[model samples]
Target chain A: ATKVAVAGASGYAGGEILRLLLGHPAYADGRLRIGALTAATSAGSTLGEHHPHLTPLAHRVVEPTEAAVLGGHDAVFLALPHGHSAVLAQQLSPETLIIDCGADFRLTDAAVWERFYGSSHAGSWPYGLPELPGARDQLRGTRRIAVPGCYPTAALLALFPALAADLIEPAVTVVAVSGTSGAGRAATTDLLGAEVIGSARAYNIAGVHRHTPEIAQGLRAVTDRDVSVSFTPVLIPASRGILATCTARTRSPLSQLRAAYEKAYHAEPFIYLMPEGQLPRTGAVIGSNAAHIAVAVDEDAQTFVAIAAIDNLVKGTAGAAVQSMNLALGWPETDGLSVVGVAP
Target chain B: VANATKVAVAGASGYAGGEILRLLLGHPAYADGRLRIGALTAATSAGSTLGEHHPHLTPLAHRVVEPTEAAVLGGHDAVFLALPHGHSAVLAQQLSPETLIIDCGADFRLTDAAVWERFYGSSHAGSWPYGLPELPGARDQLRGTRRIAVPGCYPTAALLALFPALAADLIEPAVTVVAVSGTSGAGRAATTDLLGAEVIGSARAYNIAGVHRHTPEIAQGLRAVTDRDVSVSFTPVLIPASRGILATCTARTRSPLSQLRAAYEKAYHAEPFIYLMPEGQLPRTGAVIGSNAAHIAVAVDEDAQTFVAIAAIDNLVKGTAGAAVQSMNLALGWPETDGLSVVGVAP
Candidate 1:
């Protein structure tokens, strides 16, 4: 039996974690109890006001995000923005299984963390990318975990095979596109449906994007290559999901591209290597924990490309963290994870 | 100072037909009691009130959808055929030649009947002045014309992005285009794949490897500028929204980026419907959601030797119904850009 509470429950990533938690096995075992549901800004509102999609739990009131309310729970998830998690993490007991979904503790190197984020390193936690070659071993019994950023989750999943197999170059280029819900549940002008509804525009181009180093860090961990990335993310006019179009110069013979990707991910229940002729689509993974990766050689362009699609809110953030949590708790790894997508 | 013209929409129940009625109802020609919406027709859906089917147009909701017979469509000075692709051949033959007929379907879009026959599995209705005015000789060809063939939605976005580049000989003939469009581009049919619940949170590429129906039209438009058939590998993706298209078009280029800039600026400087975005500000679908104006930008990928041109448009507007009205404006000697605005509804 476990009592779990979530901080920043009004936010997208936090609420999604809660939604998955409600469907997990412990609840069926009658041992799981949902504790405090807290929020940073919408403290007095009901869950129904923020997340009408979750109708059964709609009546729970959101409490202020405070340690006094979150302490006694068996586990607590911090889905707040990056610097904010450090302050809350300091207050939580070491025994409490703390999962931070923001970037505060995902990077192991203090210098790389400080260099890109412009903040003092909060130190590292067990990285939550459980699908990486040996990631499950690092997360198996850890008490604290750091979830990877949505964009890095897609990029690393797509590029990990090439890097691990020592087949591709360090100079990788990613031109990914994401649906509007990735902007979060904010009322900003840029996040409005009317503004993004019909357009797809590229932003944060070249190597200046914040996710650049995180992707590089993940790549460097597997290969000794320079492993730098040129990432370009475009925003599409849709509600949710991300389609990362990743390419890298590879001298690897065309015969080995598909075999390399399949060798790395073939057995993973959550990651699907698309059939040779079929490409991946975001719609096929919209509400699932699955990552659909299609590997190929654009022989004419002299490059190898891998396209991966995932529901940014699910596999990109919540489900990955929860998978790590289940492993840490000695529960079944797929306890609450689903790989079936909602498709048209 | 212009008198109103009576207009009838033969496929009032479809996306293209509904949008034309929306724009025509608001024109100044309709204000001085001149532009009149005389007939709203549909098949099978006939006898239903327009208000019952389209609730947004409260002013004309009570207008009924009549059977698409010449008895109802014949009285108007202009008629728009937004029916199924093969149906226009029979209807256009029955309509009076004096009445301007605008076909939004693919029946009249191809000049070569064999090209049309190969893709559509039917006989061609014969080509007319293509509704793409930015195309070479199309504007003059449309003047006083009695028939118009509106370009497909994807062709409109792709041509606008590559036309000027091809005209200036700035790029190679092979173009790789990827366009993401709203579900309404599939039209009002309740195809299980386009349901709002199914599509709201996803994006998928369909009709890949240049098999889309619009590929030939895109090639046809570019050949007018290059004097040779250009190769187009078009990919169409269904985006979650209801009505906007953002196309990413790229071709091998040896020319400077400004050459493309100059070609478009020089050709479209006086055009009220096309706006070249300031440098660094790429086009977003949201900026042209409900408008007919096509906002475009160019990015030069130096290492790849590819010139990328991005453009956005409302598929129904500018692409289908809006172009029909624009051609009608030219045929009747009205201002080509009248009744259409470029301001998109902001977020």
Candidate 2:
């Protein structure tokens, strides 16, 4: 059986990964086994203190996040912060299928990465956004992969089909509203239960966000045009899921707009082109890796509005990493991944 | 503040009732020696203690919840009906009309029997003065009125955001609203769907395209403004919050979409509960969670021909119990804003 070790196992992304992994058919049927769990600050504690909902793994002790602790595993997942993953992944052997859920290895351009992140580029890896063009091909047999940022995952999935279909202008202004948990499981004054539970506010407005270049790079990789994206991330009062409401100028007809999205996603399992008259909401995709997308045209304004909803921790991070792992390991593409979403 | 006028709160076991008791316990009318809480009544949970249901409300937790009836509800000068749908109007008719009836249910909100019968599938319970004092001319209708109908949470948020622009004819009537509300808006009923695991961190739009019961009430509120029917596609979504609603409402507008700010400012500037946000600063639900305030912000998509306004309100507070308290205070000839605080619990 293949064994996988997770670093930064106490964080939301890692907890979400374990939730899926534990329930995964491969893990249940003895094709896979969960190995050592490593956490940085929360090391030496039982998994129950962090993720009590995961009853089976409640008693598993968490170890310190170190190379020695993460060794002797078939696959290793790095859910750590940006720079730390680069340092950790370098120590792991190339034979190990390494998946980095941080921003360190997501960008292909050093100039673009440094400009947005204000740090030196850590180089890129095979992208893990499988729904996007060329993602599955790049992920197949890759020893290392970089999971796209949650915002970019939502933004790119919604915008790529429109960009590739040439249905609208390339200059896109995206206003994505994410639940508070998208800010991570870190305890902070802004992300506290009292502060974030009741409010939905916009921060990092006017494309000053770090995800701008990540989204641009992902979109530019698939489409042949210069995509100018203006991204605005709004922090809404929910624990998970991201609702990306993207608008762009379009002189295209409604029939053409619908056809583009249909042609792009009709065959995909995890990606859905919702039936006409129904739109996407984040709740529909919570706890699942599916991206529910809907397209609409405001005739008077001649604007194309595309809305996509996805679980930030699932489809946005952990689920995407697992999907790439399935492809890299020659397992069933749908293995250990879910298309179904939990709803209200 | 007036003398210690007694008030009974019905349906204490439910979300609305618990919220009313929480506010009434701190109410200037009830706490500052004006009004006293009479019988805290419930429907099916009569034997349970209030504390068993509302562990957060300490002052009223120990109070024994009684069965709903006129004898238990009537003697008080005011009786707040926080009962479930279809059960309220029947119990309300048992009480004397002199006893001020503030209904937090849908029974008394509809003005037309046809609208009521179509949505609720029950006979019409007569309309009362809407409890939305911020609604145009609503306070005048509520003043001295013995019966009050608290507006639905979705309508309370949508109407407050769309009212000013609709009143001045600055916008066309085709309205679309998407409101993100807390889980408590679904109430205390133990539905597997409303559980925290299913609802928290997720946002799914239900009651889409006017299938919601609040659609008629919202349309009714706007009709009074334009003297014509306004088509509104209302959608309500569930968020992780325990209370509060952030409604994103948009409509096609005439030229000068910037005038929406002026209209809202003029209409709600003097109001105690409604606050207009400054430029580029959006309204967050956490700001006014436990208060009677509605934090509203208006902005037009600079490039697109769309005018959008967002209104934030606590579904349990300003939307339900807090609104009922506002109506009761207005009816009693007391200060309309008494007992209800406008400052929200912030981060």
Candidate 3:
């Protein structure tokens, strides 16, 4: 049996990870014992208030996120902020399988890291994106792994098939619109119910988004060529899911582009390439750990635009962490991961 | 001063036409002017029961829509046709245009009789100046035109920019429009698609094959931009609201998008009703209701290869009878925007 601890467990991402872990079949068999769940603000409160859906951990008292208490666990999941995760993960035992669920150690290049993050490079670790080719080989038996960012996971999955087929150019622009839930569980003036309800608007336009570098890094690795990506994210009124519409100029025809996507995603268990003339709707992926992608060619413009949709908190965060955890423990790749989601 | 003319309204029970009666009753200039309202439904209760569905028109109880005849409306100065499209145009031609026939119908909107015959599949009545003042040179023509064709509630507001800007060659030939409207716009359809329970949190795209009758009407107004044929792909979604429309439109950028938009909207700043939003934000439909106003904005996306323009309006008021009354006031030499409003009902 393995004892698992989670930090920042009161936030939406942390709470979701705990929810999935507690309901997992293997964890329920008493093989994965949950030790401590901690948060920053709601330290002494019961978990029931924030995450009412997680009935199994309803009355568990949340403690403050501290390194000393986290070091004693057999495995620790760090869901803290980007800069803070590196400092806390340093205090954990070297033998323990520490999964960092932030961007602290995802990018390998120090210069690219400093350019985007505006801080010192915190060093890189084995990336947690197991869907990439041969990612399972690198993650097997690893002690420490860094999970990919949520927005990057969707953006990367949308562009991966095209990048692999060499159908995309060096300059690709991706415009992604996400629901207000991507802003996190905190209460803010802009996130008010009246402010967000029945409204759709764009924010952080131009080439000034934080996720631009992370997307370029992922695409660079797949194509073995340097890629330039300009990402603009809009805030829509929906509660969940990231609907990413990515367009790139391609020299290939419509039939060739369709063949390339099918060849790349035919074997993928979690990524679904929708049939022709059908686009992915945000409603279809609301509460699931799946990524739905659709590729179409505009004959008049000579450009191929791929539209990808995924639940931001699910496939983007908690599900990615579990994929990393399965790999780090040498379990089956699809052990605790499935694509089925709740529907209306 | 001209004496107040006695007017009686029928079908005060329906949505589009009923909202017309509601706004007419509230107008200070027309409140005391022989405003006798009546309503009738095909249901069993008819004249015996008040219209419980539309609570806003509760003041006009004890009257109902009767069978069409000259005896029922002979004494009134004008008759406003808020009924279905084909039925109203025939009824309007039966009445004298000198009595000021104002039609909220689509029958007389097209100039080419063949275009109307092809799309609407009915004999066409001659065209009238569209009642929307936002269209170029329409208000001046409407001031003297006795017969007026009120545009469709959706097309009037959604296509507000196309008529004027299309005349000046500021917009592109191919445009795509996606509109989100309230349940009231469904016109009381009893199908499962109109059920409120099935509508919440659910959105579907319909009329993808261009079977919608409004397609030809939108193109007819947009044809003036250039002699080249204009094509529009329109998709409408149902949302939870009472009476407003948010139309997101994208067209090929003809010039610098900002310069084109500025030149097109310069006339609206001094106009009483239209408003232009700031650069990044688009207009919301909730901002315009019970007013003869259309809110518009222009956005440029170089990546998407389209210039996005957004227009919003209250379908029932500005789109329908408010426009009709505005045209009537102009034809009668009354103050334009005198009895209308700029503020909308908001939470």
- Scored by CA lDDT, what does every candidate get? 0.81, 0.81, 0.69
Model-by-model DockQ, in order: 0.26, 0.23, 0.15
Give the CAPRI class of candidate 2.
Answer: incorrect
Please compute the TM-score of chain B alone for each predicted structure, in the order given: 0.97, 0.97, 0.90
lDDT of 2 at A75: 93
lDDT of 2 by residue, B1-347 (tens): 33557888888888998888888888776656678888988878788888999999987777898988878887888888887788778987788868888899989888999878888889997888999998889989988888999999989999999999999988878676667778899888898778877666666555543567888888899988897567765656666678888877777555474578889989998988999988777788888878999998876643334567778898988899999999888888888887799988776
User: What's model 3's lDDT at A332?
Assistant: 64
Candidate 1, lDDT over the whole model? 0.81
**lDDT digits (tens) for residues B1-347 of candidate 3:** 22443444444456755766776777655665644443233222344444555666777554554655545655566566666767766666566556666777787888888878877788887888888777767777888566778887667755774544555566667665556566677776478666765544333334432445676677777774469777765545455455677666556554676676776567576777788767666566656755667787765555434555667788777877788777867765666775688787642
lDDT of 1 at A299: 43
lDDT at residue B66 of model 3 (Cα atoms): 61
Give TM-score values for chain A, per-prediction: 0.97, 0.97, 0.95
How does model 2 do on interface RMSD, in angstroms? 5.1
Please name the candidate that would achieve the greatest DockQ relative to the true structure. Answer: 1
* Candidate 3, position B69, lDDT: 55
